[PDB]
Design a protein around this ligand. Structure first.
Ligand SMILES: COC(=O)N[C@H](C(=O)N[C@@H](Cc1ccccc1)[C@@H](O)C[C@H](Cc1ccccc1)NC(=O)O[C@H]1CO[C@H]2OCC[C@H]21)C1CC1
Lengths: 99, 99
């Protein structure tokens, strides 16, 4: 679809069998989700934005469905204020910016 | 144009008569630029991100050209790690997400 930017570009995602709301974020290299208990091994990581860094758990090869479009990649999980879909998964669903 | 997301969506902007590099960021409500000398009145403001809050100067009704498209709006100036163009100006240049 086409998403305008008058409001935060929030969409429904399906991950680990659960539905969540997430922000499509072209300014994010990586995808960061609010605290959730995903199964499997993970690696510690630190992610930075405005204000500093937070500690996250990095999970590899996680499947996420974003408005019916499937993507598979690295998902970071930690105390983020909002679920963020980053470029690593937005490239996979064929997302572009247009103006 | 149409911009894919394999690389960071960095563009050249013109502000206060100066050229800078900035990230087109659909996950940002507001536009935040690194420390710089902008003309005009300004107000102290606080903006929060993934790591916490930073102190910024809010400049209102600032002209900025983003890849040839003129926007006039609010620009925050402060210790951000990267220059970010947020939705407040992306809407003015007609930017949408498409997938
Ligand atoms: C490699 O480094 C990265 O990719 N870092 C990513 C990251 O932080 N990206 C941000 C831009 C960015 C890019 C590189 C370095 C610093 C800043 C932005 O895209 C996402 C962020 C989401 C958000 C956070 C708190 C509350 C609401 C929304 N938005 C934001 O901070 O916006 C500020 C300014 O506008 C205001 O509205 C919303 C909050 C306010 C993190 C996700 C992986």
């Amino acid at each position: 679809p086409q998403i305008t930017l008058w409001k935060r570009p929030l969409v429904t995602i399906k991950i680990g069998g659960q539905l969540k709301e997430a922000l499509l974020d072209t300014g994010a290299d990586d995808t960061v989700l609010e605290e959730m208990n995903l199964p499997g091994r993970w690696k510690p990581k630190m992610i930075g934005g405005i204000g500093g860094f937070i500690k996250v758990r990095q999970y590899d090869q996680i499947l996420i469905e974003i408005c019916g479009h499937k993507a598979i990649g690295t998902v970071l999980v930690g105390p983020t204020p909002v679920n963020i879909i980053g470029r690593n998964l937005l490239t996979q669903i064929g997302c572009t910016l247009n103006f």
